[PDB]
Design a binder for these strands. Structure first.
Ligand SMILES: [Zn+2]
Ligand SMILES: [Zn+2]
Lengths: 186, 182
RNA sequence: AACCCGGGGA
RNA sequence: AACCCCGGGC
């Protein structure tokens, strides 16, 4: 269970506004990439659980379990299917502020409760704390398909058609996040 | 039997989508049988079965009454969902063989109105002397007064509830008129 | 099936 | 929770 199946990628990163029939849960999925600055081999992994749970907290404890050398500098890229809840946003900020040897970027497929003010404040808290939050587009969806999906078996769908579909649906989501960031600068 | 005020509100709910918490909006049929000579009108309500829709049960219920076929009757049906094509065909065959009945159908919501076969069923009814219209403020009020139990007071304001149902009906009336173009 | 509102469906 | 597509949410 190291890499994701092509089916899991399609179903969980699905960024349509509404799940189609037959309905299935779009769970919280986190794909992370740890890239040391000195050029060591990057470490990759993913964690999945129900959206009500907190994959970001599991991600924090997974980073701590690696026993990283704090004299090195690390660039961390996180691909989320759902953007973080407000409590996880605060925990990520506190974690990154105490571990300044880590540089964290967050890419989200969907914006979790983006109409709710507390969830908006959580995303703004991350951006204001040197944790950039952006919406996944074609480059991010492609980078996730190449590095986190099992390619030994071909997918049932066309990978080029799926990535173009995900990028097309991302336009309205990127548009929504900029309206959130514009409202803070009032 | 009568409908509770809660059942009327929930089952005739004509919003585009059920709000949270979700509940099934199932097929409900309220009928009124009014003889021409002025006899006491007959009322009742019917719910789908696992194999018989409410319209088919309604057809069989009318036949079971042993109506005098030399009289004439006005029949009004308030439906929460508009008829499926199979029920539409059965209603037409029933009304053509029972010309002592005049049938009008009012629907709160249009059942699968984007499907061409379901549209043909509604047009078949209209073309077979069974006018199909969308329920508005008069129909919701007439159904509320004649089919709801008024012994127990509702938790909501009945006048406010009927205004909401009529407001939601405008987009549905609009949709049925687009269908009525051959 | 994260939530609401609005429009449409040859 | 009838379906699909689109737009928006101090
Ligand atoms: Zn969380
Ligand atoms: Zn039917």
């Amino acid at each position: 269970a190291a890499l994701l199946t092509a089916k899991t990628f399609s179903l969980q990163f699905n960024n349509k506004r509404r799940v189609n029939k037959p309905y299935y849960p779009r769970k919280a999925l986190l794909c992370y990439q740890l890239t040391p600055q000195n050029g060591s081999t990057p470490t990759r992994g993913h964690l999945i659980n129900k959206k009500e749970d907190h994959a970001e907290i599991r991600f924090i404890n997974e980073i701590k379990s690696m026993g990283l050398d704090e004299t090195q500098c690390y660039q961390v890229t996180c691909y989320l299917t759902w953007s973080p809840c407000p409590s996880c946003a605060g925990e990520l900020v506190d974690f990154i502020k105490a571990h300044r040897h880590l540089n964290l970027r967050i890419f989200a497929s969907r914006l979790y409760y983006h109409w709710h003010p507390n969830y908006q404040e959580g995303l703004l808290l991350l951006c204001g704390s040197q944790v950039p939050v952006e919406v996944m587009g074609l480059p991010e969806f492609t980078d996730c398909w190449e590095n986190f999906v099992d390619h030994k078996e071909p997918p049932s769908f066309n990978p080029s058609e799926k990535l173009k579909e995900l990028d097309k649906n991302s336009q309205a989501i990127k548009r929504r996040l900029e309206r959130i960031k514009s409202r803070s600068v009032d």
